[PDB]
Design a protein around this ligand. Structure first.
Ligand SMILES: [Ca+2]
Lengths: 58, 224
C-alpha cells in the first residue's frame, strides 16, 4: 500500500523487453508491462506475488 | 524497429534472437561460438536463436543453442548506461551456412553520415505494442557526436553514439536491444537506449563496438 504503487508504470529508456509487473490502482490488480531493462521506478516487480505483497490490494 | 521494412528472409545471417520464454533482445553472431549483445539484456540463462526470420513459425533454417557463458562488460553501469555491451558463448558452435554466418568486427568507427542497417524484432510502433513476427530492417545514418550530445544533454558517454533521424518516425525500439547496427560490412553498434522510440529529436543511442574490439578478442581467447 505504499505511495509508489500508485505511480504509472515506466518502461524506461532501454530497449529490451523484460516482463515485469506493476500495480494498476485503477483495476485494483497487478498487471504486466514491458520493462526496457534499466532505470526502473519502484512500481516494478519481478512477479505478481511480489507486486501483490507490496501493493495488494491497494 | 519503427518506420522500417521487413528484411529479405535470412539476408542478415548474423542477426540472432535472444529467447527466455519469448524473444527479449537481439544479438549479433561474431564467431562460430560467440554473440555480441547489450549488457542490459543480461539474464542468467539465454537461448540463442540463429537463422530466424519469422520467430513464431519453424521455417527450417533455425538453430537453437543455449548460452554456456554470459559475460557483461566489467565497466557496465546500469544507471549511466555506460559500456552497455555483453558477450555470449554458445554451448556448441553454430553451423555456419548461407543463412547463419558472422559479421566482422570494425577496424575504424563509422563516420557521421554513414548509412547503416539496424535490425530486430522490436516494437514497430512509437505508441502501442506491435511486436512483429518477421525481422525488420531500417536504413539510418550515423549522427555527429555533437548532435547526439545535443539531443541527450549530459547523457552520452564515450561508449555511445547516435544513429537515426531527428524528425522522428524511424528508430529501434523495445525488443531490439542488443541487436546490430552494421555499416560498411562491419558491426559498428549495439542497440542500447533512447527516450521513447522514434520521437522527434530523440534518436537511438547505440554502443560503439569499435571501442571494445580488444575486449571482445581477449574475452573470447580467455574463455576458450
Ligand atoms: Ca522461425
Amino acid at each position: 500500500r505504499p505511495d509508489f504503487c500508485l505511480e504509472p508504470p515506466y518502461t524506461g529508456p532501454c530497449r529490451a523487453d523484460i516482463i515485469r509487473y506493476f500495480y494498476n490502482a485503477k483495476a485494483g490488480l497487478c498487471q504486466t508491462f514491458v520493462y526496457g531493462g534499466c532505470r526502473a521506478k519502484r512500481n516494478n516487480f519481478k512477479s505478481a506475488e511480489d507486486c501483490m505483497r507490496t501493493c495488494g490490494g491497494a | 524497429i519503427v518506420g522500417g521494412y521487413t528484411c529479405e528472409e535470412n539476408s542478415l545471417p548474423y542477426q540472432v534472437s535472444l529467447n527466455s520464454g519469448s524473444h527479449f533482445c537481439g544479438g549479433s553472431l561474431i564467431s562460430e561460438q560467440w554473440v555480441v549483445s547489450a549488457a542490459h539484456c543480461y539474464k542468467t540463462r539465454i537461448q540463442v536463436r540463429l537463422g530466424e526470420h519469422n520467430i513464431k513459425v519453424l521455417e527450417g533454417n533455425e538453430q537453437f543453442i543455449n548460452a554456456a557463458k554470459i559475460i557483461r562488460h566489467p565497466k557496465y553501469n546500469r544507471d549511466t548506461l555506460d559500456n552497455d555491451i555483453m558477450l555470449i558463448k554458445l554451448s556448441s558452435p553454430a553451423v555456419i551456412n548461407a543463412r547463419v554466418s558472422t559479421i566482422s568486427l570494425p577496424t575504424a568507427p563509422p563516420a557521421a553520415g554513414t548509412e547503416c542497417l539496424i535490425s530486430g524484432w522490436g516494437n514497430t510502433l512509437s505508441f502501442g505494442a506491435d511486436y512483429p513476427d518477421e525481422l525488420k530492417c531500417l536504413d539510418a545514418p550515423v549522427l555527429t557526436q555533437a548532435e547526439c550530445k545535443a539531443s541527450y544533454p549530459g547523457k552520452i558517454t564515450n561508449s555511445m553514439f547516435c544513429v537515426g533521424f531527428l524528425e522522428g518516425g524511424k528508430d529501434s525500439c523495445q525488443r531490439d536491444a542488443g541487436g546490430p547496427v552494421v555499416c560498411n560490412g562491419q558491426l559498428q553498434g549495439v542497440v542500447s537506449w533512447g527516450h521513447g522510440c522514434a520521437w522527434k529529436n530523440r534518436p537511438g543511442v547505440y554502443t560503439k563496438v569499435y571501442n571494445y574490439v580488444d575486449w571482445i578478442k581477449d574475452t573470447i581467447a580467455a574463455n576458450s
